[PDB]
């Protein structure tokens, strides 16, 4: 409102430059209401599409990444780029600026292989597996023996 406040503690021009004690309103007309700006505080950042999708990706250019595809890849979806260091291998050393998939990335953080094969009946595979499962290191391709052939084809323990 014109020179008035919201509640009205002060209502004319004499004190034009001050704000209200219990509530905040410094006044000149509602033009201050049309020129002022507020901001939203984003949780986890996002990027300006004005810079990401212009033909020469100004961030793709500057950051040597796939100028047009590496961006889109990690930006909008989950394709991770190893930022500083990552000792463990894929087969080769840590990829300083290279990007990887959920799948392989998964294989990384928890352990090489996830195999949950749970037996059909109560006595056939429950026994083959048990006997060799608790303290016995099971080598790749451990041929459990009963329903069909419970195949454990990967690493260390069980």
List residues forming the annotated binding site for Zn(2+): 5, 7, 20, 23
How far apart, in whole angstroms, are the C-alpha atoms of residue 81 and residue 44?
A: 17
Among 6, 30, 98, 143, binds other proteins (CB under 8 A): 30
Indicate whether 2 belongs to the interface with other proteins (CB under 8 A): yes
For CA atoms 123, 127, 133, 139, give the dihedral sign.
negative
Residue 62 interacting entry, from Zn ion, other proteins, none, C-beta within 5 to 8 Å by type: other proteins
Q: Hunting for tokens 């008035």 — which residue is that? A: 4
- Breaks, C-N > 2.5 A, in the chain lie after none
Of 83, 71, 78, whose CA–CA distance to 104 is shortest? 78
Partner whose footprint covers residue 38, from other proteins, Zn ion, none (CB < 5 to 8 Å by kind): other proteins
Smaller CB distance to other proteins: residue 18 or 143? Answer: 18
- Binding-site entries: 5, 7, 20, 23
Output 22 or 78, the one with its CB closest to other proteins. 78
């Amino acid at each position: 409102k014109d020179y008035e406040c919201a509640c009205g503690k002060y209502k004319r021009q004499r004190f034009e430059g001050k704000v209200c004690e219990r509530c905040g309103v410094e006044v000149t007309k509602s033009i201050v209401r049309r020129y002022r700006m507020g901001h939203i505080e984003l949780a986890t950042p996002a990027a300006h599409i004005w810079f990401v999708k212009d033909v020469p990706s100004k961030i793709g250019t500057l950051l040597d990444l796939s100028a047009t595809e590496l961006e889109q890849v990690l930006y909008f979806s989950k394709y991770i780029v190893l930022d500083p260091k990552g000792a463990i291998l894929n087969g080769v050393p840590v990829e300083k600026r290279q990007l990887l998939t959920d799948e392989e990335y998964r294989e990384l953080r928890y352990g090489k292989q996830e195999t949950y094969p749970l037996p059909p009946g109560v006595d056939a595979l429950v026994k083959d597996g048990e006997e060799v499962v608790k303290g016995q290191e099971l080598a790749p391709g451990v041929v459990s023996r009963l329903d069909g052939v419970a195949l454990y084809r990967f690493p260390r323990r069980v």
